[PDB]
Amino acid sequence: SVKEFLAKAKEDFLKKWENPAQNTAHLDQFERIKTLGTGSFGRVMLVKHMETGNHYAMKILDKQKVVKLKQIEHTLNEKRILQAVNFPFLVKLEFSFKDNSNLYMVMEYVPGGEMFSHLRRIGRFSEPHARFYAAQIVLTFEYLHSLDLIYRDLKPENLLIDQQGYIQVTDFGFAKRVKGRTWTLCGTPEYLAPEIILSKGYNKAVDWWALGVLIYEMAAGYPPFFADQPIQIYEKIVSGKVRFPSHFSSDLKDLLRNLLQVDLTKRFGNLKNGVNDIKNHKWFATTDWIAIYQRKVEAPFIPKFKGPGDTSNFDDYEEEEIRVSINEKCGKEFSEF
């Protein structure tokens, strides 16, 4: 059943993967309202689709800036993977298009805000709260990894909370479809596996490492390896001496010792049993895995929901007007977008 869900899912992903959707909207179909977040090449805005009156989250990327930083391949990956996937806890792409100056990805709007904001505000989540989120990630990485996708950027910043209090993963900008091995140093310092830092070649197991970081940070209030500068973070990660807060249950600590594990013959998620090594862990024993997938578990936290168009769960950012040039920029580099 788990095996034939993943086989249908792979067949659906692969037809979209080999023939991506292109040019399914235009900028003038949307009213731009407010910036929900930023990145290297631009921003994500709340928009309103004028024809239906539906709200969406539109990513706008400046093509010239992508080229200046040598990240063309990353942004093609983001859109090609997003358009192809389908899972309850992945933010859904509704449309995508490009013009002379920019690339656009219109996603569902997830109004509860970033896990990061609620975590920093609250301080830390209880084990049951953290577990509820962790399960959704476990099931998401099961799906993505079955498609030969590595995510490579798990962190509370990239986990949105939706109106029922469930997770939607965003930010596929570092995601990559790979059988075998890959080498780029990428991700967030605090979330990186040792093998990434040491330029060893790595695979999907880095995402399971990242999950250990996230669980640790959700439950502690702070990450297992931190310092003011990235180079000192790396140094703490390669030593691999994790200190656990005294309030951590003995089961949590044991799970964490198996995810934050430098040795890839011992790291959960990677091994022969696979993801079952995680699902059947004792920390997860109260977890009804099928009920998480079906969204029948009641979330420990529903964010305030102030009607559509409301952004009170997001921080404020400086707005900047979209400029569209009359000449086509970087047409050939972005032709498949």
């Binding site: 900008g173 990428c186 605090e190």
Partner: peptide, 19 residues
């Protein structure tokens, strides 16, 4: 404490990924 050191650190805001 570890919590105090984290809260006094320069890394409690949004983290950027590296390339």
């Amino acid at each position: 404490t570890t919590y105090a050191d984290f809260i006094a650190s320069g890394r409690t805001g949004r983290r950027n990924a590296i390339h």
